Amino acid sequence: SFTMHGTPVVNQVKVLTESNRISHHKILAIVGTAESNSEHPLGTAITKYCKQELDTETLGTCIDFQVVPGCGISCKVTNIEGLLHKNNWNIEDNNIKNASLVQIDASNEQSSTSSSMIIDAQISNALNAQQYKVLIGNREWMIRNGLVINNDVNDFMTEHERKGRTAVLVAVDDELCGLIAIADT
């Protein structure tokens, strides 16, 4: 029923900045953990590639995820260094639903209420990590953001899109940082 088309793979990822603003490993993390969201089968494929290259389950960052089709993604990311044994008490399930009413005239099988939220919990811990603004999109949206591309990589990306496969750059707070080549197959 649900499957009809072939499934893509992440093929090559390459760095495009030195450790001056952000280092290669910290870039690999924020690129991967930004797809811990609920977007597409490629997000599961990115997170699965990245977490296996990290060789640790110790990831998962809050993201202000914004999306434009045919152009790219923009997000605000936090909790990067915060993978640690926390300053808090690890209370992430505790909630007080405080329900009311039960009837014969309503015949069971209702939605069931919810109350409480995960408030104040991160505010003791969040001082352990930097907050970053991160953007992922094609060469044509990067130059429109106010960034500039280099001709050596622009040829490789041109040739990859001519080969009918999907190609994007990564940037952080108005600096270049990497590229991603994904095989449509």
Side-chain angles (χ1 to χ4, degrees), residues 4-49:
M4 197 193 302
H5 299 99
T7 307
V9 293
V10 62
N11 155 61
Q12 290 164 267
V13 295
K14 291 182 68 166
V15 186
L16 196 45
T17 199
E18 291 179 289
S19 303
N20 185 11
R21 187 73 211 267
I22 350 79
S23 196
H24 65 89
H25 167 248
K26 199 167 302 196
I27 295 163
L28 171 61
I30 64 190
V31 169
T33 334
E35 281 290 354
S36 202
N37 204 2
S38 311
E39 291 296 304
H40 311 302
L42 278 180
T44 309
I46 278 176
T47 55
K48 282 172 68 172
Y49 160 75

mmCIF file of all heavy atoms in Angstrom, residues 4-49:
data_model
loop_
_atom_site.group_PDB
_atom_site.id
_atom_site.type_symbol
_atom_site.label_atom_id
_atom_site.label_comp_id
_atom_site.label_asym_id
_atom_site.label_seq_id
_atom_site.Cartn_x
_atom_site.Cartn_y
_atom_site.Cartn_z
ATOM 1 N N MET A 4 5.949 3.213 -2.924
ATOM 2 C CA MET A 4 5.797 3.350 -4.383
ATOM 3 C C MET A 4 7.103 3.756 -5.099
ATOM 4 O O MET A 4 7.272 3.448 -6.281
ATOM 5 C CB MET A 4 4.685 4.382 -4.658
ATOM 6 C CG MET A 4 4.143 4.330 -6.093
ATOM 7 S SD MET A 4 3.104 5.736 -6.586
ATOM 8 C CE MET A 4 1.795 5.674 -5.333
ATOM 9 N N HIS A 5 8.044 4.409 -4.411
ATOM 10 C CA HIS A 5 9.271 4.972 -4.990
ATOM 11 C C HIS A 5 10.544 4.526 -4.244
ATOM 12 O O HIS A 5 10.488 4.082 -3.090
ATOM 13 C CB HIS A 5 9.145 6.502 -5.057
ATOM 14 C CG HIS A 5 7.994 6.972 -5.920
ATOM 15 N ND1 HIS A 5 6.752 7.383 -5.484
ATOM 16 C CD2 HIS A 5 7.979 7.040 -7.288
ATOM 17 C CE1 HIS A 5 6.008 7.689 -6.561
ATOM 18 N NE2 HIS A 5 6.721 7.516 -7.691
ATOM 19 N N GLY A 6 11.699 4.621 -4.910
ATOM 20 C CA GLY A 6 13.010 4.269 -4.349
ATOM 21 C C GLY A 6 13.473 5.197 -3.218
ATOM 22 O O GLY A 6 13.026 6.343 -3.107
ATOM 23 N N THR A 7 14.389 4.712 -2.375
ATOM 24 C CA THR A 7 14.782 5.373 -1.117
ATOM 25 C C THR A 7 16.223 5.910 -1.171
ATOM 26 O O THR A 7 17.143 5.121 -1.403
ATOM 27 C CB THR A 7 14.610 4.420 0.078
ATOM 28 O OG1 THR A 7 13.296 3.890 0.077
ATOM 29 C CG2 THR A 7 14.804 5.139 1.414
ATOM 30 N N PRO A 8 16.454 7.217 -0.933
ATOM 31 C CA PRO A 8 17.782 7.831 -1.011
ATOM 32 C C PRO A 8 18.708 7.495 0.176
ATOM 33 O O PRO A 8 18.272 7.013 1.227
ATOM 34 C CB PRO A 8 17.515 9.338 -1.133
ATOM 35 C CG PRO A 8 16.206 9.519 -0.367
ATOM 36 C CD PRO A 8 15.443 8.245 -0.705
ATOM 37 N N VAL A 9 20.003 7.788 0.006
ATOM 38 C CA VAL A 9 21.088 7.554 0.987
ATOM 39 C C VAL A 9 22.016 8.769 1.100
ATOM 40 O O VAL A 9 22.271 9.443 0.098
ATOM 41 C CB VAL A 9 21.917 6.295 0.635
ATOM 42 C CG1 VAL A 9 21.092 5.017 0.787
ATOM 43 C CG2 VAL A 9 22.499 6.315 -0.786
ATOM 44 N N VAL A 10 22.572 9.048 2.287
ATOM 45 C CA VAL A 10 23.630 10.073 2.424
ATOM 46 C C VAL A 10 24.945 9.487 1.910
ATOM 47 O O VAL A 10 25.375 8.422 2.350
ATOM 48 C CB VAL A 10 23.713 10.691 3.837
ATOM 49 C CG1 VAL A 10 24.061 9.719 4.969
ATOM 50 C CG2 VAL A 10 24.718 11.850 3.856
ATOM 51 N N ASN A 11 25.576 10.148 0.938
ATOM 52 C CA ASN A 11 26.687 9.580 0.181
ATOM 53 C C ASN A 11 28.061 10.165 0.582
ATOM 54 O O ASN A 11 28.994 9.396 0.847
ATOM 55 C CB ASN A 11 26.303 9.716 -1.302
ATOM 56 C CG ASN A 11 27.534 9.741 -2.173
ATOM 57 O OD1 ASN A 11 28.309 8.796 -2.208
ATOM 58 N ND2 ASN A 11 27.805 10.853 -2.797
ATOM 59 N N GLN A 12 28.189 11.493 0.649
ATOM 60 C CA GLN A 12 29.427 12.191 1.036
ATOM 61 C C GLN A 12 29.103 13.436 1.876
ATOM 62 O O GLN A 12 28.257 14.242 1.483
ATOM 63 C CB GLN A 12 30.225 12.617 -0.220
ATOM 64 C CG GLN A 12 30.861 11.474 -1.029
ATOM 65 C CD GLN A 12 31.274 11.934 -2.425
ATOM 66 O OE1 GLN A 12 30.521 11.817 -3.386
ATOM 67 N NE2 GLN A 12 32.454 12.488 -2.595
ATOM 68 N N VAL A 13 29.804 13.630 2.997
ATOM 69 C CA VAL A 13 29.775 14.875 3.791
ATOM 70 C C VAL A 13 31.190 15.409 4.013
ATOM 71 O O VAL A 13 32.103 14.644 4.353
ATOM 72 C CB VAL A 13 29.018 14.733 5.128
ATOM 73 C CG1 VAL A 13 27.536 14.450 4.880
ATOM 74 C CG2 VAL A 13 29.559 13.642 6.057
ATOM 75 N N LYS A 14 31.379 16.713 3.779
ATOM 76 C CA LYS A 14 32.690 17.385 3.787
ATOM 77 C C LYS A 14 32.639 18.747 4.483
ATOM 78 O O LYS A 14 31.700 19.516 4.284
ATOM 79 C CB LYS A 14 33.213 17.541 2.346
ATOM 80 C CG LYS A 14 33.603 16.203 1.704
ATOM 81 C CD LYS A 14 34.174 16.322 0.283
ATOM 82 C CE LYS A 14 35.538 17.023 0.268
ATOM 83 N NZ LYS A 14 36.215 16.830 -1.033
ATOM 84 N N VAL A 15 33.680 19.059 5.253
ATOM 85 C CA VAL A 15 33.822 20.311 6.012
ATOM 86 C C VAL A 15 34.287 21.463 5.107
ATOM 87 O O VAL A 15 35.027 21.254 4.139
ATOM 88 C CB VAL A 15 34.775 20.099 7.212
ATOM 89 C CG1 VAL A 15 34.840 21.329 8.126
ATOM 90 C CG2 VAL A 15 34.332 18.925 8.097
ATOM 91 N N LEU A 16 33.839 22.684 5.425
ATOM 92 C CA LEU A 16 34.089 23.906 4.643
ATOM 93 C C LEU A 16 34.495 25.132 5.504
ATOM 94 O O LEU A 16 34.567 26.260 5.011
ATOM 95 C CB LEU A 16 32.863 24.114 3.725
ATOM 96 C CG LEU A 16 33.003 25.087 2.539
ATOM 97 C CD1 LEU A 16 34.297 24.911 1.746
ATOM 98 C CD2 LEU A 16 31.842 24.842 1.568
ATOM 99 N N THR A 17 34.818 24.920 6.785
ATOM 100 C CA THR A 17 35.394 25.926 7.703
ATOM 101 C C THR A 17 36.387 25.284 8.683
ATOM 102 O O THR A 17 36.260 24.101 9.006
ATOM 103 C CB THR A 17 34.272 26.663 8.450
ATOM 104 O OG1 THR A 17 34.728 27.879 8.993
ATOM 105 C CG2 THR A 17 33.630 25.871 9.592
ATOM 106 N N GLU A 18 37.370 26.029 9.183
ATOM 107 C CA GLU A 18 38.285 25.581 10.255
ATOM 108 C C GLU A 18 37.658 25.763 11.650
ATOM 109 O O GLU A 18 36.594 26.365 11.781
ATOM 110 C CB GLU A 18 39.612 26.356 10.132
ATOM 111 C CG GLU A 18 40.411 25.953 8.885
ATOM 112 C CD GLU A 18 41.714 26.751 8.779
ATOM 113 O OE1 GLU A 18 41.658 27.969 8.484
ATOM 114 O OE2 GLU A 18 42.814 26.181 8.972
ATOM 115 N N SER A 19 38.301 25.274 12.716
ATOM 116 C CA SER A 19 37.739 25.269 14.086
ATOM 117 C C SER A 19 37.516 26.657 14.725
ATOM 118 O O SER A 19 37.083 26.730 15.873
ATOM 119 C CB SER A 19 38.604 24.406 15.013
ATOM 120 O OG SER A 19 38.728 23.075 14.530
ATOM 121 N N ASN A 20 37.781 27.751 14.002
ATOM 122 C CA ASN A 20 37.729 29.148 14.448
ATOM 123 C C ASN A 20 36.380 29.545 15.101
ATOM 124 O O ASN A 20 36.369 29.991 16.252
ATOM 125 C CB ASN A 20 38.094 30.004 13.214
ATOM 126 C CG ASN A 20 38.213 31.497 13.470
ATOM 127 O OD1 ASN A 20 38.224 31.971 14.593
ATOM 128 N ND2 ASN A 20 38.300 32.287 12.424
ATOM 129 N N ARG A 21 35.243 29.340 14.409
ATOM 130 C CA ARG A 21 33.880 29.521 14.961
ATOM 131 C C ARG A 21 33.299 28.204 15.494
ATOM 132 O O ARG A 21 32.748 28.176 16.595
ATOM 133 C CB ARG A 21 32.955 30.157 13.895
ATOM 134 C CG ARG A 21 31.563 30.551 14.429
ATOM 135 C CD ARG A 21 31.581 31.795 15.332
ATOM 136 N NE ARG A 21 30.534 31.739 16.367
ATOM 137 C CZ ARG A 21 29.310 32.227 16.339
ATOM 138 N NH1 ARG A 21 28.779 32.784 15.293
ATOM 139 N NH2 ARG A 21 28.588 32.124 17.412
ATOM 140 N N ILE A 22 33.413 27.128 14.708
ATOM 141 C CA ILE A 22 32.919 25.780 15.034
ATOM 142 C C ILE A 22 33.862 24.709 14.467
ATOM 143 O O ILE A 22 34.296 24.819 13.320
ATOM 144 C CB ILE A 22 31.471 25.497 14.532
ATOM 145 C CG1 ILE A 22 30.634 26.678 13.989
ATOM 146 C CG2 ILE A 22 30.691 24.821 15.668
ATOM 147 C CD1 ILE A 22 31.010 27.072 12.552
ATOM 148 N N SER A 23 34.152 23.662 15.243
ATOM 149 C CA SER A 23 34.998 22.528 14.833
ATOM 150 C C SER A 23 34.215 21.393 14.152
ATOM 151 O O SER A 23 33.029 21.190 14.427
ATOM 152 C CB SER A 23 35.789 21.999 16.031
ATOM 153 O OG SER A 23 36.847 21.192 15.555
ATOM 154 N N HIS A 24 34.891 20.610 13.301
ATOM 155 C CA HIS A 24 34.327 19.515 12.492
ATOM 156 C C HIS A 24 33.368 18.555 13.241
ATOM 157 O O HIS A 24 32.284 18.255 12.732
ATOM 158 C CB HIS A 24 35.501 18.730 11.872
ATOM 159 C CG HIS A 24 36.385 18.026 12.879
ATOM 160 N ND1 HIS A 24 36.191 16.751 13.358
ATOM 161 C CD2 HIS A 24 37.446 18.550 13.568
ATOM 162 C CE1 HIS A 24 37.078 16.528 14.338
ATOM 163 N NE2 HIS A 24 37.880 17.594 14.497
ATOM 164 N N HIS A 25 33.718 18.114 14.458
ATOM 165 C CA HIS A 25 32.911 17.186 15.268
ATOM 166 C C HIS A 25 31.621 17.845 15.784
ATOM 167 O O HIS A 25 30.545 17.246 15.758
ATOM 168 C CB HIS A 25 33.784 16.672 16.427
ATOM 169 C CG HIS A 25 33.031 15.951 17.523
ATOM 170 N ND1 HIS A 25 32.860 16.403 18.814
ATOM 171 C CD2 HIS A 25 32.400 14.738 17.441
ATOM 172 C CE1 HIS A 25 32.148 15.491 19.491
ATOM 173 N NE2 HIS A 25 31.847 14.447 18.698
ATOM 174 N N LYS A 26 31.710 19.116 16.191
ATOM 175 C CA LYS A 26 30.572 19.896 16.691
ATOM 176 C C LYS A 26 29.599 20.263 15.563
ATOM 177 O O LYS A 26 28.392 20.281 15.788
ATOM 178 C CB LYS A 26 31.131 21.096 17.473
ATOM 179 C CG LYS A 26 30.094 21.724 18.422
ATOM 180 C CD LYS A 26 30.701 22.717 19.432
ATOM 181 C CE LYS A 26 31.785 22.047 20.290
ATOM 182 N NZ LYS A 26 32.133 22.830 21.494
ATOM 183 N N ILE A 27 30.112 20.453 14.341
ATOM 184 C CA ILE A 27 29.318 20.598 13.106
ATOM 185 C C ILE A 27 28.576 19.292 12.773
ATOM 186 O O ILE A 27 27.366 19.323 12.555
ATOM 187 C CB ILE A 27 30.212 21.082 11.937
ATOM 188 C CG1 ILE A 27 30.738 22.507 12.223
ATOM 189 C CG2 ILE A 27 29.450 21.071 10.597
ATOM 190 C CD1 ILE A 27 31.937 22.913 11.358
ATOM 191 N N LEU A 28 29.268 18.144 12.794
ATOM 192 C CA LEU A 28 28.672 16.821 12.541
ATOM 193 C C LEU A 28 27.506 16.526 13.501
ATOM 194 O O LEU A 28 26.445 16.071 13.063
ATOM 195 C CB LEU A 28 29.787 15.757 12.641
ATOM 196 C CG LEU A 28 29.304 14.293 12.616
ATOM 197 C CD1 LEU A 28 28.576 13.934 11.318
ATOM 198 C CD2 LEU A 28 30.497 13.354 12.781
ATOM 199 N N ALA A 29 27.685 16.837 14.787
ATOM 200 C CA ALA A 29 26.634 16.749 15.795
ATOM 201 C C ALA A 29 25.422 17.622 15.427
ATOM 202 O O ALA A 29 24.351 17.074 15.188
ATOM 203 C CB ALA A 29 27.233 17.095 17.163
ATOM 204 N N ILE A 30 25.563 18.950 15.311
ATOM 205 C CA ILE A 30 24.393 19.829 15.091
ATOM 206 C C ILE A 30 23.678 19.583 13.753
ATOM 207 O O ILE A 30 22.455 19.699 13.709
ATOM 208 C CB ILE A 30 24.719 21.323 15.321
ATOM 209 C CG1 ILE A 30 25.755 21.871 14.313
ATOM 210 C CG2 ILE A 30 25.128 21.518 16.793
ATOM 211 C CD1 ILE A 30 26.302 23.272 14.624
ATOM 212 N N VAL A 31 24.390 19.162 12.698
ATOM 213 C CA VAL A 31 23.771 18.691 11.441
ATOM 214 C C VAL A 31 22.913 17.446 11.682
ATOM 215 O O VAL A 31 21.774 17.386 11.220
ATOM 216 C CB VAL A 31 24.840 18.408 10.364
ATOM 217 C CG1 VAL A 31 24.288 17.677 9.129
ATOM 218 C CG2 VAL A 31 25.448 19.726 9.870
ATOM 219 N N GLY A 32 23.436 16.455 12.408
ATOM 220 C CA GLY A 32 22.712 15.218 12.689
ATOM 221 C C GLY A 32 21.526 15.416 13.633
ATOM 222 O O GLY A 32 20.396 15.059 13.301
ATOM 223 N N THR A 33 21.750 16.017 14.801
ATOM 224 C CA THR A 33 20.723 16.160 15.849
ATOM 225 C C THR A 33 19.574 17.094 15.450
ATOM 226 O O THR A 33 18.460 16.937 15.959
ATOM 227 C CB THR A 33 21.287 16.552 17.232
ATOM 228 O OG1 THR A 33 22.624 16.174 17.453
ATOM 229 C CG2 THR A 33 20.534 15.831 18.325
ATOM 230 N N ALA A 34 19.780 18.019 14.503
ATOM 231 C CA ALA A 34 18.697 18.808 13.908
ATOM 232 C C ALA A 34 17.665 17.963 13.128
ATOM 233 O O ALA A 34 16.516 18.375 12.987
ATOM 234 C CB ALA A 34 19.312 19.896 13.021
ATOM 235 N N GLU A 35 18.020 16.755 12.675
ATOM 236 C CA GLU A 35 17.100 15.831 11.998
ATOM 237 C C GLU A 35 16.502 14.792 12.964
ATOM 238 O O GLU A 35 15.716 13.936 12.548
ATOM 239 C CB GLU A 35 17.818 15.198 10.801
ATOM 240 C CG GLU A 35 17.858 16.141 9.585
ATOM 241 C CD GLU A 35 16.499 16.373 8.900
ATOM 242 O OE1 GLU A 35 15.480 15.737 9.263
ATOM 243 O OE2 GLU A 35 16.457 17.155 7.919
ATOM 244 N N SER A 36 16.773 14.910 14.275
ATOM 245 C CA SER A 36 16.073 14.153 15.333
ATOM 246 C C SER A 36 14.582 14.549 15.436
ATOM 247 O O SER A 36 13.814 13.914 16.161
ATOM 248 C CB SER A 36 16.793 14.337 16.676
ATOM 249 O OG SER A 36 16.487 13.289 17.573
ATOM 250 N N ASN A 37 14.174 15.568 14.664
ATOM 251 C CA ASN A 37 12.811 16.020 14.381
ATOM 252 C C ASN A 37 11.948 14.925 13.692
ATOM 253 O O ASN A 37 12.287 13.737 13.713
ATOM 254 C CB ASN A 37 12.960 17.298 13.514
ATOM 255 C CG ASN A 37 11.768 18.238 13.577
ATOM 256 O OD1 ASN A 37 10.795 18.013 14.282
ATOM 257 N ND2 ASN A 37 11.784 19.326 12.851
ATOM 258 N N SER A 38 10.826 15.308 13.074
ATOM 259 C CA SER A 38 9.829 14.383 12.500
ATOM 260 C C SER A 38 9.545 14.665 11.014
ATOM 261 O O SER A 38 8.393 14.640 10.565
ATOM 262 C CB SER A 38 8.542 14.421 13.331
ATOM 263 O OG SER A 38 8.784 14.282 14.719
ATOM 264 N N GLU A 39 10.589 15.000 10.252
ATOM 265 C CA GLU A 39 10.490 15.520 8.883
ATOM 266 C C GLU A 39 10.303 14.444 7.804
ATOM 267 O O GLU A 39 9.176 14.261 7.341
ATOM 268 C CB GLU A 39 11.687 16.439 8.595
ATOM 269 C CG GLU A 39 11.629 17.745 9.392
ATOM 270 C CD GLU A 39 10.415 18.606 8.998
ATOM 271 O OE1 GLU A 39 10.256 18.931 7.800
ATOM 272 O OE2 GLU A 39 9.573 18.937 9.871
ATOM 273 N N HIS A 40 11.370 13.762 7.376
ATOM 274 C CA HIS A 40 11.353 12.824 6.244
ATOM 275 C C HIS A 40 12.213 11.572 6.531
ATOM 276 O O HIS A 40 13.050 11.603 7.438
ATOM 277 C CB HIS A 40 11.876 13.538 4.977
ATOM 278 C CG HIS A 40 11.261 14.881 4.674
ATOM 279 N ND1 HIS A 40 9.928 15.156 4.465
ATOM 280 C CD2 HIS A 40 11.940 16.058 4.522
ATOM 281 C CE1 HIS A 40 9.805 16.469 4.213
ATOM 282 N NE2 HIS A 40 11.010 17.067 4.238
ATOM 283 N N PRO A 41 12.123 10.490 5.724
ATOM 284 C CA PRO A 41 12.995 9.313 5.858
ATOM 285 C C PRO A 41 14.502 9.627 5.824
ATOM 286 O O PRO A 41 15.293 8.911 6.444
ATOM 287 C CB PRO A 41 12.594 8.384 4.706
ATOM 288 C CG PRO A 41 11.127 8.737 4.468
ATOM 289 C CD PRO A 41 11.111 10.245 4.703
ATOM 290 N N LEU A 42 14.898 10.716 5.151
ATOM 291 C CA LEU A 42 16.272 11.226 5.142
ATOM 292 C C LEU A 42 16.759 11.722 6.507
ATOM 293 O O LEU A 42 17.939 11.579 6.811
ATOM 294 C CB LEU A 42 16.401 12.356 4.101
ATOM 295 C CG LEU A 42 16.608 11.863 2.661
ATOM 296 C CD1 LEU A 42 16.717 13.061 1.719
ATOM 297 C CD2 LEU A 42 17.892 11.038 2.550
ATOM 298 N N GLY A 43 15.872 12.243 7.351
ATOM 299 C CA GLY A 43 16.219 12.665 8.707
ATOM 300 C C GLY A 43 16.640 11.485 9.584
ATOM 301 O O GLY A 43 17.701 11.499 10.217
ATOM 302 N N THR A 44 15.864 10.399 9.543
ATOM 303 C CA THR A 44 16.251 9.119 10.150
ATOM 304 C C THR A 44 17.568 8.592 9.557
ATOM 305 O O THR A 44 18.433 8.157 10.309
ATOM 306 C CB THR A 44 15.125 8.084 10.012
ATOM 307 O OG1 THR A 44 13.901 8.613 10.473
ATOM 308 C CG2 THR A 44 15.386 6.838 10.849
ATOM 309 N N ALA A 45 17.788 8.709 8.241
ATOM 310 C CA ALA A 45 19.039 8.277 7.600
ATOM 311 C C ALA A 45 20.276 9.109 8.023
ATOM 312 O O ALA A 45 21.337 8.529 8.278
ATOM 313 C CB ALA A 45 18.849 8.273 6.078
ATOM 314 N N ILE A 46 20.140 10.437 8.149
ATOM 315 C CA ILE A 46 21.184 11.359 8.644
ATOM 316 C C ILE A 46 21.527 11.050 10.095
ATOM 317 O O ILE A 46 22.696 10.844 10.421
ATOM 318 C CB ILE A 46 20.744 12.840 8.482
ATOM 319 C CG1 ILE A 46 21.035 13.267 7.028
ATOM 320 C CG2 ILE A 46 21.414 13.803 9.494
ATOM 321 C CD1 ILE A 46 20.559 14.687 6.712
ATOM 322 N N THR A 47 20.516 11.004 10.965
ATOM 323 C CA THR A 47 20.724 10.722 12.395
ATOM 324 C C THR A 47 21.376 9.349 12.589
ATOM 325 O O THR A 47 22.359 9.256 13.322
ATOM 326 C CB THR A 47 19.427 10.832 13.211
ATOM 327 O OG1 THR A 47 18.419 10.011 12.672
ATOM 328 C CG2 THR A 47 18.858 12.241 13.285
ATOM 329 N N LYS A 48 20.936 8.314 11.855
ATOM 330 C CA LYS A 48 21.550 6.974 11.855
ATOM 331 C C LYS A 48 23.004 6.956 11.366
ATOM 332 O O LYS A 48 23.817 6.271 11.985
ATOM 333 C CB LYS A 48 20.680 5.998 11.042
ATOM 334 C CG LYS A 48 19.450 5.542 11.848
ATOM 335 C CD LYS A 48 18.451 4.716 11.025
ATOM 336 C CE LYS A 48 18.978 3.341 10.613
ATOM 337 N NZ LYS A 48 17.909 2.528 9.990
ATOM 338 N N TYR A 49 23.360 7.702 10.315
ATOM 339 C CA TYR A 49 24.759 7.843 9.876
ATOM 340 C C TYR A 49 25.613 8.549 10.943
ATOM 341 O O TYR A 49 26.663 8.033 11.342
ATOM 342 C CB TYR A 49 24.828 8.597 8.531
ATOM 343 C CG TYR A 49 26.194 9.205 8.238
ATOM 344 C CD1 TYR A 49 27.265 8.389 7.825
ATOM 345 C CD2 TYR A 49 26.415 10.577 8.479
ATOM 346 C CE1 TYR A 49 28.556 8.935 7.663
ATOM 347 C CE2 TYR A 49 27.708 11.120 8.345
ATOM 348 C CZ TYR A 49 28.783 10.301 7.937
ATOM 349 O OH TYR A 49 30.028 10.837 7.819
#
